[PDB]
Design an enzyme around this catalytic site. Sequence first.
Site, mmCIF file in Angstrom:
data_model
loop_
_atom_site.group_PDB
_atom_site.id
_atom_site.type_symbol
_atom_site.label_atom_id
_atom_site.label_comp_id
_atom_site.label_asym_id
_atom_site.label_seq_id
_atom_site.Cartn_x
_atom_site.Cartn_y
_atom_site.Cartn_z
ATOM 1 N N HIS A 104 99.631 -102.946 29.419
ATOM 2 C CA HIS A 104 100.028 -103.295 28.052
ATOM 3 C C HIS A 104 100.749 -102.093 27.284
ATOM 4 N N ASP B 148 135.455 -100.809 27.475
ATOM 5 C CA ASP B 148 134.148 -100.608 28.198
ATOM 6 C C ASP B 148 133.757 -99.031 28.363
ATOM 7 N N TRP C 140 97.204 -95.275 29.874
ATOM 8 C CA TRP C 140 98.799 -95.014 30.191
ATOM 9 C C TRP C 140 99.007 -93.645 30.464
ATOM 10 N N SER D 128 116.824 -95.210 35.763
ATOM 11 C CA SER D 128 117.769 -95.933 34.882
ATOM 12 C C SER D 128 118.074 -95.301 33.636
ATOM 13 N N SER D 129 116.848 -94.662 32.806
ATOM 14 C CA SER D 129 117.417 -94.268 31.409
ATOM 15 C C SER D 129 118.095 -92.935 31.783
ATOM 16 N N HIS E 218 105.946 -86.327 23.587
ATOM 17 C CA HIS E 218 106.487 -86.445 22.313
ATOM 18 C C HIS E 218 107.743 -86.668 22.190
ATOM 19 N N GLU F 272 109.292 -88.623 24.139
ATOM 20 C CA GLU F 272 109.132 -90.184 24.107
ATOM 21 C C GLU F 272 109.120 -90.881 22.920
ATOM 22 N N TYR G 71 109.825 -90.098 20.242
ATOM 23 C CA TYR G 71 111.098 -90.153 19.209
ATOM 24 C C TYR G 71 112.065 -91.020 19.781
ATOM 25 N N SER H 50 120.006 -98.138 8.526
ATOM 26 C CA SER H 50 120.955 -97.465 7.776
ATOM 27 C C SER H 50 122.125 -98.632 7.676
ATOM 28 N N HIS I 69 99.729 -80.736 20.378
ATOM 29 C CA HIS I 69 98.970 -81.394 19.367
ATOM 30 C C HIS I 69 98.293 -82.506 19.818
ATOM 31 N N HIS I 70 98.512 -83.188 21.021
ATOM 32 C CA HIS I 70 97.645 -83.961 21.757
ATOM 33 C C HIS I 70 96.517 -83.547 22.279
ATOM 34 N N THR J 290 112.361 -86.100 8.036
ATOM 35 C CA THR J 290 112.012 -87.778 7.756
ATOM 36 C C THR J 290 111.995 -88.033 6.528
ATOM 37 N N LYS K 95 115.368 -88.625 5.109
ATOM 38 C CA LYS K 95 115.883 -89.939 5.323
ATOM 39 C C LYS K 95 115.493 -91.038 4.517
ATOM 40 N N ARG L 70 88.015 -94.617 21.944
ATOM 41 C CA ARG L 70 88.985 -95.435 22.443
ATOM 42 C C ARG L 70 88.482 -95.901 24.035
HETATM 43 C C1 HEA Z 1 106.388 -93.947 17.859
HETATM 44 C C2 HEA Z 1 106.074 -93.658 16.780
HETATM 45 C C3 HEA Z 1 105.689 -92.253 16.490
HETATM 46 C C4 HEA Z 1 106.267 -91.305 15.885
HETATM 47 C C5 HEA Z 1 107.524 -91.376 15.020
HETATM 48 C C6 HEA Z 1 105.552 -90.221 15.877
HETATM 49 C C7 HEA Z 1 105.710 -88.829 15.355
HETATM 50 C C8 HEA Z 1 104.757 -88.330 14.468
HETATM 51 N N1 HEA Z 1 103.369 -88.124 15.306
HETATM 52 FE FE1 HEA Z 1 103.089 -88.890 16.987
HETATM 53 N N2 HEA Z 1 102.243 -90.082 18.297
HETATM 54 C C9 HEA Z 1 102.478 -91.367 18.345
HETATM 55 C C10 HEA Z 1 103.365 -92.207 17.790
HETATM 56 C C11 HEA Z 1 104.306 -91.683 16.872
HETATM 57 N N3 HEA Z 1 104.375 -90.250 16.610
HETATM 58 C C12 HEA Z 1 101.659 -91.902 19.620
HETATM 59 C C13 HEA Z 1 101.432 -93.379 20.126
HETATM 60 C C14 HEA Z 1 100.865 -90.865 20.119
HETATM 61 C C15 HEA Z 1 99.796 -90.663 21.186
HETATM 62 C C16 HEA Z 1 98.966 -91.740 21.500
HETATM 63 C C17 HEA Z 1 98.257 -91.393 22.513
HETATM 64 O O1 HEA Z 1 98.793 -90.650 23.231
HETATM 65 O O2 HEA Z 1 97.067 -92.030 22.984
HETATM 66 C C18 HEA Z 1 101.297 -89.743 19.139
HETATM 67 C C19 HEA Z 1 100.930 -88.466 19.174
HETATM 68 C C20 HEA Z 1 100.823 -87.684 17.783
HETATM 69 C C21 HEA Z 1 99.497 -87.374 17.493
HETATM 70 C C22 HEA Z 1 98.336 -86.571 18.378
HETATM 71 C C23 HEA Z 1 97.125 -87.739 17.757
HETATM 72 C C24 HEA Z 1 95.893 -87.273 18.779
HETATM 73 O O3 HEA Z 1 95.763 -87.685 20.196
HETATM 74 O O4 HEA Z 1 95.118 -86.268 18.300
HETATM 75 C C25 HEA Z 1 99.622 -86.842 16.007
HETATM 76 C C26 HEA Z 1 98.680 -86.014 15.263
HETATM 77 O O5 HEA Z 1 97.905 -85.148 15.914
HETATM 78 C C27 HEA Z 1 100.775 -87.425 15.613
HETATM 79 C C28 HEA Z 1 101.273 -87.413 14.606
HETATM 80 C C29 HEA Z 1 102.636 -87.695 14.395
HETATM 81 C C30 HEA Z 1 103.575 -87.167 13.249
HETATM 82 C C31 HEA Z 1 102.989 -86.506 11.986
HETATM 83 C C32 HEA Z 1 104.845 -87.609 13.296
HETATM 84 C C33 HEA Z 1 105.925 -87.386 12.387
HETATM 85 O O6 HEA Z 1 107.112 -87.747 12.998
HETATM 86 C C34 HEA Z 1 105.916 -88.375 11.309
HETATM 87 C C35 HEA Z 1 106.308 -87.852 9.996
HETATM 88 C C36 HEA Z 1 106.430 -89.032 8.754
HETATM 89 C C37 HEA Z 1 106.277 -88.680 7.730
HETATM 90 C C38 HEA Z 1 105.999 -87.517 7.299
HETATM 91 C C39 HEA Z 1 106.838 -89.662 6.476
HETATM 92 C C40 HEA Z 1 107.771 -88.891 5.730
HETATM 93 C C41 HEA Z 1 107.594 -89.439 4.559
HETATM 94 C C42 HEA Z 1 107.744 -88.656 3.144
HETATM 95 C C43 HEA Z 1 107.662 -89.400 1.912
HETATM 96 C C44 HEA Z 1 107.928 -87.320 3.398
HETATM 97 C C45 HEA Z 1 106.866 -86.440 2.625
HETATM 98 C C46 HEA Z 1 106.591 -85.170 3.035
HETATM 99 C C47 HEA Z 1 105.432 -84.569 3.374
HETATM 100 C C48 HEA Z 1 104.211 -85.584 3.292
HETATM 101 C C49 HEA Z 1 105.104 -83.158 3.406
HETATM 102 N N4 HEA Z 1 101.220 -88.130 16.934
HETATM 103 C C1 HEA Z 2 104.891 -100.345 22.158
HETATM 104 C C2 HEA Z 2 103.969 -100.214 21.143
HETATM 105 C C3 HEA Z 2 102.769 -101.267 21.081
HETATM 106 C C4 HEA Z 2 102.697 -102.408 20.881
HETATM 107 C C5 HEA Z 2 104.054 -103.461 20.837
HETATM 108 C C6 HEA Z 2 101.712 -102.849 20.886
HETATM 109 C C7 HEA Z 2 101.078 -104.168 20.586
HETATM 110 C C8 HEA Z 2 99.718 -104.388 20.067
HETATM 111 N N1 HEA Z 2 98.744 -103.587 20.344
HETATM 112 FE FE1 HEA Z 2 98.770 -101.769 20.990
HETATM 113 N N2 HEA Z 2 98.889 -100.119 22.327
HETATM 114 C C9 HEA Z 2 99.838 -99.526 22.247
HETATM 115 C C10 HEA Z 2 100.868 -99.510 21.324
HETATM 116 C C11 HEA Z 2 101.607 -100.611 21.197
HETATM 117 N N3 HEA Z 2 100.506 -101.818 20.846
HETATM 118 C C12 HEA Z 2 99.724 -98.544 23.335
HETATM 119 C C13 HEA Z 2 100.609 -97.262 23.453
HETATM 120 C C14 HEA Z 2 98.479 -98.743 23.712
HETATM 121 C C15 HEA Z 2 97.837 -98.121 24.943
HETATM 122 C C16 HEA Z 2 96.805 -96.971 24.611
HETATM 123 C C17 HEA Z 2 96.002 -96.682 25.724
HETATM 124 O O1 HEA Z 2 96.590 -96.071 27.061
HETATM 125 O O2 HEA Z 2 94.846 -96.677 25.721
HETATM 126 C C18 HEA Z 2 98.203 -99.556 23.173
HETATM 127 C C19 HEA Z 2 96.680 -100.515 23.522
HETATM 128 C C20 HEA Z 2 96.220 -101.243 22.588
HETATM 129 C C21 HEA Z 2 95.078 -101.729 22.504
HETATM 130 C C22 HEA Z 2 93.910 -101.282 23.511
HETATM 131 C C23 HEA Z 2 93.453 -99.846 23.194
HETATM 132 C C24 HEA Z 2 92.337 -99.431 23.761
HETATM 133 O O3 HEA Z 2 91.205 -100.062 23.704
HETATM 134 O O4 HEA Z 2 92.015 -98.462 24.478
HETATM 135 C C25 HEA Z 2 94.703 -102.582 21.545
HETATM 136 C C26 HEA Z 2 93.696 -103.231 20.942
HETATM 137 O O5 HEA Z 2 92.532 -102.927 21.205
HETATM 138 C C27 HEA Z 2 95.906 -102.545 20.826
HETATM 139 C C28 HEA Z 2 96.345 -103.201 19.698
HETATM 140 C C29 HEA Z 2 97.524 -103.976 19.723
HETATM 141 C C30 HEA Z 2 97.855 -105.461 19.235
HETATM 142 C C31 HEA Z 2 96.741 -106.320 18.796
HETATM 143 C C32 HEA Z 2 99.099 -105.613 19.594
HETATM 144 C C33 HEA Z 2 99.911 -107.075 19.398
HETATM 145 O O6 HEA Z 2 99.686 -107.337 17.637
HETATM 146 C C34 HEA Z 2 101.444 -107.169 19.773
HETATM 147 C C35 HEA Z 2 102.028 -107.245 18.365
HETATM 148 C C36 HEA Z 2 103.044 -108.219 18.313
HETATM 149 C C37 HEA Z 2 104.283 -107.800 18.816
HETATM 150 C C38 HEA Z 2 104.914 -106.301 18.711
HETATM 151 C C39 HEA Z 2 105.378 -108.865 18.940
HETATM 152 C C40 HEA Z 2 106.364 -108.244 20.112
HETATM 153 C C41 HEA Z 2 107.649 -109.017 20.030
HETATM 154 C C42 HEA Z 2 108.254 -109.464 20.936
HETATM 155 C C43 HEA Z 2 107.697 -109.472 22.386
HETATM 156 C C44 HEA Z 2 109.666 -110.034 20.953
HETATM 157 C C45 HEA Z 2 110.666 -108.666 21.153
HETATM 158 C C46 HEA Z 2 111.774 -108.496 20.163
HETATM 159 C C47 HEA Z 2 112.942 -108.303 20.803
HETATM 160 C C48 HEA Z 2 113.014 -108.090 22.075
HETATM 161 C C49 HEA Z 2 114.075 -108.632 19.795
HETATM 162 N N4 HEA Z 2 96.936 -102.033 21.487
HETATM 163 CU CU LIG Z 3 102.743 -85.957 19.424
#
Ligand code: HEA
Ligand code: HEA
Ligand SMILES: [Cu+2]
Lengths: 268, 56, 374, 117, 535, 124, 58, 48, 100, 236
Positions: E64, E94, E129, E159-160, E243, E245, E247, E258, E292-293, E318, E321, E440
């Site tokens: 998944h 193209d 994963w 591919s990527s 990380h 990835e 982004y 936008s 931080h992971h 961020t 934006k 988890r």
């Molecule tokens: C794809 C979406 C996504 C994005 C964009 C990011 C980006 C960021 N991620 Fe990442 N992150 C994940 C998805 C994502 N992450 C996933 C899936 C994992 C690991 C899961 C795993 O491996 O099992 C991970 C890993 C990960 C971890 C590790 C968690 C752990 O295993 O302990 C943490 C925190 O420790 C974290 C935090 C953040 C933060 C702070 C950002 C920042 O970029 C976000 C910043 C956003 C804001 C700040 C909003 C800003 C709004 C404002 C109004 C500004 C205000 C200003 C302040 C608050 C000062 N991310």
């Molecule tokens: C891509 C990011 C993503 C997405 C889409 C989802 C989808 C969902 N995920 Fe999450 N989930 C993760 C991120 C994501 N997850 C990751 C990274 C893991 C692995 C963690 C691990 O390795 O342990 C995980 C695993 C995971 C688990 C198992 C975690 C565990 O026990 O360890 C669970 C629930 O337990 C959960 C919750 C859900 C649910 C309920 C949905 C559902 O709600 C699905 C939501 C519905 C959609 C998003 C619809 C999708 C749309 C279409 C298919 C059409 C596409 C559109 C276009 C192409 C135009 N996810």
């Molecule tokens: Cu991270």
Amino acid sequence: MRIQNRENLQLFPFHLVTNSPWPLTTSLALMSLALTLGLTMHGYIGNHLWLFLAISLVLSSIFLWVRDVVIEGTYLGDHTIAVRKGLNIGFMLFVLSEILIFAALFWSYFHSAMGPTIEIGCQWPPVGITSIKPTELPLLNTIILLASGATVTWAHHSILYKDRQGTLVGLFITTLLIILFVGCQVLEYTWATFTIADSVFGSIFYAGTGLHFIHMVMLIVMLAICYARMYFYHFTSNHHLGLETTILYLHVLDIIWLFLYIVFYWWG
Amino acid sequence: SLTRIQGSVKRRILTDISVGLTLGFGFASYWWWGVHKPTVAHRENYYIELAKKKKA
Amino acid sequence: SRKLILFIVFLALLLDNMLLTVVVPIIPSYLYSIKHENVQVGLLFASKATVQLITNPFIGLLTNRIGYPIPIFAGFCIMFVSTIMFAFSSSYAFLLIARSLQGIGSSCSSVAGMGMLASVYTDDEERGNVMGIALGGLAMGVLVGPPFGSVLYEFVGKTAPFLVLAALVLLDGAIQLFVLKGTPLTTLLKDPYILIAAGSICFANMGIAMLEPALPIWMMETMCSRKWQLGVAFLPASISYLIGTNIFGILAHKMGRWLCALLGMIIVGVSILCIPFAKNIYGLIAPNFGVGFAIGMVDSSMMPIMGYLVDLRHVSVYGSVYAIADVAFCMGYAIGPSAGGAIAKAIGFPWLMTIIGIIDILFAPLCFFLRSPP
Amino acid sequence: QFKTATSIAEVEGLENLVGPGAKTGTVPTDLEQATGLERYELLGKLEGIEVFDETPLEAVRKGTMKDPILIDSYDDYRYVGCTGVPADSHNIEWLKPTTEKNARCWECGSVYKLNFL
Amino acid sequence: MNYINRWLFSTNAKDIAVLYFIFALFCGLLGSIMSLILRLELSAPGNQILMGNHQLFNVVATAHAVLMVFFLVMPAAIGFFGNYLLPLMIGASDMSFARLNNISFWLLPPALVSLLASALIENGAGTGWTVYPPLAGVQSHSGPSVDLAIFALHLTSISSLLGAINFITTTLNMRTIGMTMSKLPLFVWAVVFTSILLLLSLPVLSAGVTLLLLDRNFNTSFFEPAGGGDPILYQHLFWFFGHPEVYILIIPGFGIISHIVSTYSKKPVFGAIGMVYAMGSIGFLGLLVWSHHMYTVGLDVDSRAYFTSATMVIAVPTGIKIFSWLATLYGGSIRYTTPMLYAFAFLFLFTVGGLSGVVLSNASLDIAFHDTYYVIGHFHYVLSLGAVFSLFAGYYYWSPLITGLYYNNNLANIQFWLLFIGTNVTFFPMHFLGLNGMPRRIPDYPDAFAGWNAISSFGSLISIISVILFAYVIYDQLVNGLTNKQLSTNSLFKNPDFIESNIIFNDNSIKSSSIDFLLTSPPLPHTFNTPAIQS
Amino acid sequence: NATVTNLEKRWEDLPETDQKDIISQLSERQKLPWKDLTLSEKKAAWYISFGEWGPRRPVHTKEDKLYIFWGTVIGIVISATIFGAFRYNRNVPKTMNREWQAASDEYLKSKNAEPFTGYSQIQS
Amino acid sequence: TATEKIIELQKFYQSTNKPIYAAHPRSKYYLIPYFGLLGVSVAATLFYTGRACFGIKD
Amino acid sequence: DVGPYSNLPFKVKNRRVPYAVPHFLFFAIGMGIPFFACYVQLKRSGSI
Amino acid sequence: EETYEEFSQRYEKEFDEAYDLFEVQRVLNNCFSYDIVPSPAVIGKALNACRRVNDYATAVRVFEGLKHKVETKEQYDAYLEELKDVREELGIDLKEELFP
Amino acid sequence: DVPTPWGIFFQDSATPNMEGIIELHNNIMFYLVLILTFVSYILYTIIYNYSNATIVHKYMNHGQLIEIVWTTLPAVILLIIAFPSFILLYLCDEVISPAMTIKAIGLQWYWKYEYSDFINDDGEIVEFESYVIPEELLEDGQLRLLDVDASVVVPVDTHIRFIVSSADVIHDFCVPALGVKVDASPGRLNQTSALIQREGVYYGQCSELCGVMHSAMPIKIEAVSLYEFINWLDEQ
Ligand code: HEA
Ligand code: HEA
Ligand SMILES: [Cu+2]
Ligand code: CUA
Ligand SMILES: [Zn+2]
């Protein structure tokens, strides 16, 4: 755009490639390679004549792409100034990707070297692992690579002054001078007293000096295709993008070797 | 007069940033003086009563 | 806590030498469009060395009476004032005053801070590790500083790079508020061998000292370079340092430290000579890499040589090598920029680099004497 | 495949761009071996003619319906991007003038017409 | 033979985007059903569907994650919107390397076969994963399953990389007559910045995964601590890719938003140059923070202090934006079309998801949240509610310009509301479960965690209904799509201004800032014969 | 009079050749000085240009929001009915009973647990 | 004729009417073996990936 | 033949078997593959 | 950076040189798009431009944009007590007197 | 401490470290709530005032003072958060005199505890193994998937230093109420410390994935008084 009969020729300097079957074939060859390799290591095949066929098909697929990339530059005539610049940018963006697989290997060597574990008695190359003397054949290789770097510059300065016998000789000596590197580095794996599995040292040593081997066979192939494409009058004095591509690959490989000789053979 | 209107959106922006922050500080000053501090007080009074029993 | 003290001193040194290089991409250009001289800019980059070298004798007397913490907080105050002056200063006098104050601030955050770490850690083995870890960001400061200044100068105004440092300094000062007789240097600068060892570092780093003020002007004139690019040309050297001190730190133990220093001098001299023959910014990547790598080799080889020479020929104290290196670095940075205008106005930029390169190459053969010292 | 050109006055297609051959024992030049849209560039840069123009549009005068700005096109339409009379004042609005109707640029008002070549 | 020379032997960039779309839907349906299977087993305490198999729950989770990080978001967001749109926006006919585009497509279907065969050749590949070294060995997983999933992360990587090189080399020298690299639209910048990260991050993952394969099959002792290796090395070599990835999946979304905010709020973007520098800074500071992971592995106290600081700095770019999108929506007129609803639901839910990141970047607080469902709820708000919403908005925005066929607005609105409710009901209680202490990757849990697990399994059945309704919306778009342009004024790309008469509007209807919406209803196979001009 | 009077109830049913004749008759009737225009002509000129037809219609009519609301409700009543079916057929272990979660409370009371906010394992 | 057939193959690849990879009267020797062996390689990796899902080993 | 149903790999109008069959089978297969794997691995390990 | 007295000169100049209806509506749409409400002199030029181009709906819609631009209702009635000789001379009728 | 059925917030603390974690979290949530309320209010204003509006302000596109205010204000919040984080990171630890050592070796699907003190001249070191009680063998009232046959027993008000290692794969020692979460890799020794302020029973669960039965590896820590610890230690 006010030239008299201008509509009869393309209005932009870019190449519209005709439909080709090679992307699909390479993908199907890689599928077979992946599945056959993932099975043959765990039973399920037995005979190793399928993996070899898969590798042969992949290599033939790249060769058949490159044929069509040569018929479009020497015969059809579609490489303007812009397309050549795009090709150069592309090649640099692949050399850069190939340099960042070596950084990972170097960081896998400094993450074990500095901080050696308790299990191995704290010492690099540890007790019972006799290293290779770096005042032997691994100096002859460095001298050979430096010489090859200078023999190809005499090949690119003889195609600009219009000397044919003097661009064929340089390429010939360069190709005979990278085969000796492979021979020396294949006589230094059969005269070694430590294998892949006897430590963490012999597993990183043969994974940064074993990928360089694969990258140096490709130089022999590229330089052969550049000698044979000059023997047949395919290169002009100002339009030769195969020599330039092969020269920027030789130099990167030499610079990488100078960091596998002072970090792997000398440092320790 | 009433036929010379010059800047109206700027005043709106200033009023809408000076009310999105008063709300925020109001909804964040309830998390620290109505949800957090009494919890710490309850925690501490529990420990200043578990020690008096031991002293006795 | 001991760890918090190490954090304080590390961040103090990092911010001190970070503010010494964000100036470089900026002031040479800022004082180059206000006019629309060489010695003037050369001395703007040399007040720090003179002030620090003249204040080191007296900061020790200051730290004997009041103690450690108050002198440390004084470095805080002086450096915050300096960063604010650099934030808003278009008159050459103000910038010169800022650089002059930076020297006192830097000397107060090094003599006092290193003594504080020495006082806290009394083990004689943990001291080496703590002092090494604290002095490592000293070099990271001029790796994270040049690019940041150039990028924020092109993208944003002058004050943007210079207020972030002020904020970080203020955080450090808040943390500081929350937390709170060996053979003399004179005699150790008398025996010839340590004199050679210190001269090695001085002539090695004079090249970078001269490149710091002069290079942006020549780059702007002969290159038409943009504001940001001035930082990027200095990236390859700093990164190169972090490579050279990791490989040739252990390798010199088996290749001979004297040979390492002698080879590094030749490499840096050739790299310095190759700089004048550059027409594009890509041409600066190679010579900067060479100069950084050679300086890394020279430091990593000579400095333990100074430690051994001091502890063999004389009796030693912990800050002896540090004091020797401070005098060497400050003398080099004073001399380099100061002679830069004099040797670059009468004769072109290529000539000054050629002179320094020939000097380094000709000083290289003297490294034979350090082999098998008495 | 047919008679060879000597300048861009004698190029009626890709049949006029094959060229002579080099002689055995020399590195051939680009006037002796080059065929397609590569030799057209050579034959143009040896006279001064740039076959592939890279000049942005006119931003000196505005455009009225009586006197419209004339965009040259080898098709019935051409995409035109307007940014203003001072040439970066207006933001970018994209336009498609055709042989039956003229673009008009909803902010500044410049009118555009096609010269069909 | 005309079929084969256009949809198997292809050179056209817009004919490959459609194949990416059709592949992405398939691989996003598979993953969604695999999520439903997990969410039906985690409903009440006990062993409910998967009868007692704790394997086949880890296999489902791994398949998944892989199926819907590597096979849904990347192909859709880089191929369907990058390949089809970037050449049109920058004015190129193209791409520079067409055969590389075709190979980038065709390496994916043979990558799905290996992954699906990694779930049937034996008990499976339940390594998570992140395929950690000492579990993904030959003592717990002894079979051709982990290998066949590693070979699915090589083909995708190739591919990527090949797509990234094409993207960077097409935006540099294949622009129009007057388009410099300061007038490019924001989506092109998004693709360029994601393509630089793909070059700079993929090789490290390739090295790490190949070394794991060599340890499994050739006895190399890279990560075995009995020969002098450390498993922690793998973690480094994974998270350097990990990380960047996360982004790569989000930067292409930003650009899309936008454009939407610039159209339905008839106003240009507040500070476009600022947005470009903000994306650049987010990309650059995504390489310097990867540990931080792994705070619980035993790092020093001077490395935790650095990584706490280097993670909170990403919030600054961020915030720029987010505030710029609010500023661009502020003064203008807003019409609530189906793309704009998704744009609004991304400006609020992404903020909710990213603010939990600043609570997890601290090393001190990660002792209470690591290996906990708080992280799951974190990244679902930024992945499921941030990136999938951007994909849906992009589809509803650019589908009429691609196909020439319109969609029913009422059904799209129903789908939007169902996704909103279901996603907000499924992921929010995970925060509470995480705070109370639920780890988890556990099939069965203690009795105390039952209640929220019953509320989080009710939202999944509301999102699957949204997916089915999405299928029916596509059906009504393809069948009787031509007669769906008169039902609502959603069809119009821009309404008339106040003083613009209807008669004048009908003659001059399209007012745009990109070449996208001036093209034909289906764009011509060769769109640009005579070059476009810019001032 | 009849041609222009009450164009709000007839305008859209006319073909596109009876629409360009009304506009081409109000454009030679506006060249005259105004105050010579009948009220019907004044209202028709306003409606033809600034009116609620064509490009100026709403995205959402009153009969579309009801449709969306009652479509969301009928999509939440299906998920509920599917979830109840998967809820009656559960594997309820021995622990999920009130006579077992009152026994665990005695243990957690003896070994004083959750002195603050609360211990209670009863959820039936 | 002489070693410069370049001005004779440039008049052949232009005006050909066949795809450029199957125009020369030598592409048979490259394309028959390649497509022949590709179909055996792909039909051997689909016989051993369905024979492996069922547990059959060699 | 440029037009509204020309850039799609599949035919949608003037078709023998109505398009609903190919449209439905696509989604059915997509949502049924993840259950076949579970059935195979459950029946390979004793479980029902 | 532009003052009220430069706004109200630039837009008068723009309104005295429109030649079609598209141009009148363009200049009217970019006049009601700033922070400055147009002065009574600028709107006096807009109505004459609408009379030269021979359009009635645009002259009624100008007065209907004022009541959305202004802040209160007293300001709107202060615009209509001074633009009353222009209306009764040209013949323009506001929307609330037509009830369309 | 045991989880509660419908939980919303942290478990109850028994160590100073967990109290610091709670206080820091509640400090950060202040600013996070401020920012969320601000963004939500501006979206509400946008929907309420500017929905289908006649006037479009298409010339407000630059900003200069407002652009410096959303680049400096979020930075100040980050510094304010970073101060207490660094103080807590560097302050709270085993500064003086650890008083007891327990080695927790994590095997595949159980735990092994050794008490490094209490050694005789012949190597009589106290040791045991903790397994999970299956559902079939639970007694009246025992907790499912958290209750073990042998439980770690420690005194109250004594520093306890846990040294965590592993024998097969990467595990994770975690007891939430005490604020302990350390990893257990196969070739290194990790360490944590805890001081327990009140008597009771504290339950915990493994964190990192280890295979099939990763759901069955509970940890149970009792904090008995010193007399009961002495009586316990004199029977084992
Ligand atoms: C794809 C979406 C996504 C994005 C964009 C990011 C980006 C960021 N991620 Fe990442 N992150 C994940 C998805 C994502 N992450 C996933 C899936 C994992 C690991 C899961 C795993 O491996 O099992 C991970 C890993 C990960 C971890 C590790 C968690 C752990 O295993 O302990 C943490 C925190 O420790 C974290 C935090 C953040 C933060 C702070 C950002 C920042 O970029 C976000 C910043 C956003 C804001 C700040 C909003 C800003 C709004 C404002 C109004 C500004 C205000 C200003 C302040 C608050 C000062 N991310
Ligand atoms: C891509 C990011 C993503 C997405 C889409 C989802 C989808 C969902 N995920 Fe999450 N989930 C993760 C991120 C994501 N997850 C990751 C990274 C893991 C692995 C963690 C691990 O390795 O342990 C995980 C695993 C995971 C688990 C198992 C975690 C565990 O026990 O360890 C669970 C629930 O337990 C959960 C919750 C859900 C649910 C309920 C949905 C559902 O709600 C699905 C939501 C519905 C959609 C998003 C619809 C999708 C749309 C279409 C298919 C059409 C596409 C559109 C276009 C192409 C135009 N996810
Ligand atoms: Cu991270
Ligand atoms: Cu042990 Cu998990
Ligand atoms: Zn314009």
